Amino acid sequence: RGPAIGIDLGTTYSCVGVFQHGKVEIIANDQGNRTTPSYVAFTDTERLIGDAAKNQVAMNPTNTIFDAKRLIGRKFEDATVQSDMKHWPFRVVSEGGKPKVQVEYKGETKTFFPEEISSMVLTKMKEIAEAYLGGKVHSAVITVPAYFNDSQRQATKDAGTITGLNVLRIINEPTAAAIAYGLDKKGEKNVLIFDLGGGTFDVSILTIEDGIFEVKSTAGDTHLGGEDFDNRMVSHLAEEFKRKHKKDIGPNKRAVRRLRTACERAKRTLSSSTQASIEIDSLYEGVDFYTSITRARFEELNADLFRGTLEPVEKALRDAKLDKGQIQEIVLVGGSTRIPKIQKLLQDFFNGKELNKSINPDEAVAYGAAVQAAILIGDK
Numbered sequence: 501r502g503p504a505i506g507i508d509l510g511t512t513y514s515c516v517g518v519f520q521h522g523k524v525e526i527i528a529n530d531q532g533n534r535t536t537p538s539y540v541a542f543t544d545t546e547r548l549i550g551d552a553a554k555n556q557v558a559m560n561p562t563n564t565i566f567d568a569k570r571l572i573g574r575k576f577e578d579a580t581v582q583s584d585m586k587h588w589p590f591r592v593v594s595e596g597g598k599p600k601v602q603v604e605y606k607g608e609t610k611t612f613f614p615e616e617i618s619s620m621v622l623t624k625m626k627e628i629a630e631a632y633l634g635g636k637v638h639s640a641v642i643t644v645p646a647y648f649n650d651s652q653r654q655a656t657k658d659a660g661t662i663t664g665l666n667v668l669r670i671i672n673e674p675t676a677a678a679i680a681y682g683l684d685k686k687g688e689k690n691v692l693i694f695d696l697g698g699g700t701f702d703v704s705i706l707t708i709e710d711g712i713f714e715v716k717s718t719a720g721d722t723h724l725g726g727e728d729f730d731n732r733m734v735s736h737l738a739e740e741f742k743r744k745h746k747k748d749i750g751p752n753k754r755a756v757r758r759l760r761t762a763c764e765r766a767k768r769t770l771s772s773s774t775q776a777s778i779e780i781d782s783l784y785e786g787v788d789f790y791t792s793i794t795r796a797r798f799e800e801l802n803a804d805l806f807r808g809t810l811e812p813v814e815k816a817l818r819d820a821k822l823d824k825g826q827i828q829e830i831v832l833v834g835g836s837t838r839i840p841k842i843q844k845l846l847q848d849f850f851n852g853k854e855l856n857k858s859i860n861p862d863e864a865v866a867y868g869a870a871v872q873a874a875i876l877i878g879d880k
Contacts, residue, residue: 501666502638504879506869507625508673509618509642509656511569512698514538515866516625518633519874524680526863527632529624535862536628539566540620542605549624558757561589563603565617567699570722571599572614572659573652580722618659626663639666641873643865646672646704646715668876674704675713676868677833681856684711690826692816694846695833696809699725703812705820705827717819719812724805726767726836732801733763733793737778740791747784755784770795771838799841806841810849824850831856833864 504519513535517526529536531551539553541564548556557564570584576594585592591602593611600611622642629637642665644656653670660667674693678684683691688709695702701724705716737759742748749755758780766776774795783789799806817824832855836842847855859867874880 501668501877502636503629503633504870504874504877505626505629505637505640506676506866506871506873507622507640507642508676508863508865508869509569509621509625509644509659510535510538510697511567511700512538513862514621514625515863516629517863517866517870518629519870519880522880524867524870525632526860526866527629529628530631534860536621536624537566538569538618538621539564540568540617541565542603542610544606547605547620549620563590563605565590565601565603565612568601568614568617568621571601572618573649573655574599574614615655615659615662618656619662622659622663622665626665637665639668639873639877641668641676641869641876642670643673643676643869644670645702646674647702647718648672668873671869671872672704672713672715673702673833673865674706674715674831676865676872677831678706678708678713678829678868679871680859680864680868681829681831683829683831683856684708684713686829689828690716690820690822691829691831692813692827693831693833694809694813694837695720696836696842697725697834698727698836699723701725701809701812701834703816705816705822716822717816719816719819721812724809725834726764728805729798729802729836729839730760730763730767732805733767733798734760736797736801737763737789737791737793741783741789745784745787745789747787749784752784758783759789766793767798770798771840795840802841806839806845809842810845813846813849827853829856831864832861835862837861 506517508515515535517524526534528534536550537554541548541553574581575597576599592599593602602611626637657667677693678691691706693704702720704718707714762778769776778791780789
């Protein structure tokens with residue numbers, strides 16, 4: 501059954517890891533990136549997957565698919581599908597009651613099931629692993645949200661099957677994060693997983709006893725993440741540009757997009773420095789925009805969004821019939837949990853308790869999946 505491989509198949513980014521020689525290694529892709537966009541693009545001559553797809557998304561938005569994870573295993577008439585469709589730039593249609601994405605490809609209209617799109621992403625993940633390891637990869641553990649039903653889980657396994665992976669197990673994302681931190685080895689333990697990515701927020705409370713995990717509650721917001729925090733910065737800096745150079749970029753989609761790109765990077769910088777520099781040449785009518793933004797102003801622009809993440813924590817606890825003091829371990833998952841203010845708010849809510857954060861939060865799910873793949877093949 502091959503080398504031990506774990507895959508975090510994410511709504512907008514994916515990550516792959518291997519357990520080798522006693523430890524997990526997260527595998528960088530051919531551009532050196534340790535996470536890979538869950539994006540597939542169709543052009544006049546080819547299908548692009550991963551960074552290559554995401555890199556051309558602004559130039560080919562109606563034929564570049566992402567968020568297939570929000571469709572997989574659902575019916576077309578499902579409320580979440582009909583709501584999500586209103587904000588994607590690509591078309592979603594029905595075939596036998598199932599959703600399919602519709603694109604132009606080589607000058608013709610084609611439709612693809614969500615499991616087909618997701619298989620294309622898994623194939624890229626398999627290739628990334630084979631480049632790193634040599635030889636062929638045979639098996640994988642793939643992760644899903646704890647709230648996924650059996651249809652959703654089976655369609656994810658079908659994506660793997662189409663790729664040519666033996667799917668050893670589909671396990672829950674919060675369970676994978678707990679495994680990564682060895683929390684099953686460290687009596688009953690109540691564990692809270694706080695998973696704030698680019699586009700989704702999931703809080704899960706698990707119990708672990710004698711190596712067995714039970715999900716006790718879930719909560720969150722399916723359309724909250726890093727993109728929302730960036731947009732607050734975009735509005736702010738667009739106003740600054742208008743104040744300083746008397747030009748309104750609002751109506752110009754290229755200029756807004758370029759400012760958003762710059763803001764996304766600045767936000768990353770603000771997780772480890774107290775200021776960040778924006779440097780955009782010819783933003784609008786030949787006018788450059790060079791400026792700086794402090795962590796303090798970033799936190800202030802997002803005050804509601806950051807404090808608001810405690811509400812799903814409170815709700816998960818209520819549904820689990822737990823007091824906050826009965827949580828033994830808190831685990832951070834998702835790139836947005838690097839934000840100092842979000843850590844501080846969570847730590848204070850939990851009366852100063854230290855958070856599990858030593859594994860890159862973008863990687864912890866894949867890490868745990870790779871550990872579980874090892875156990876199942878008998879490589880550990």
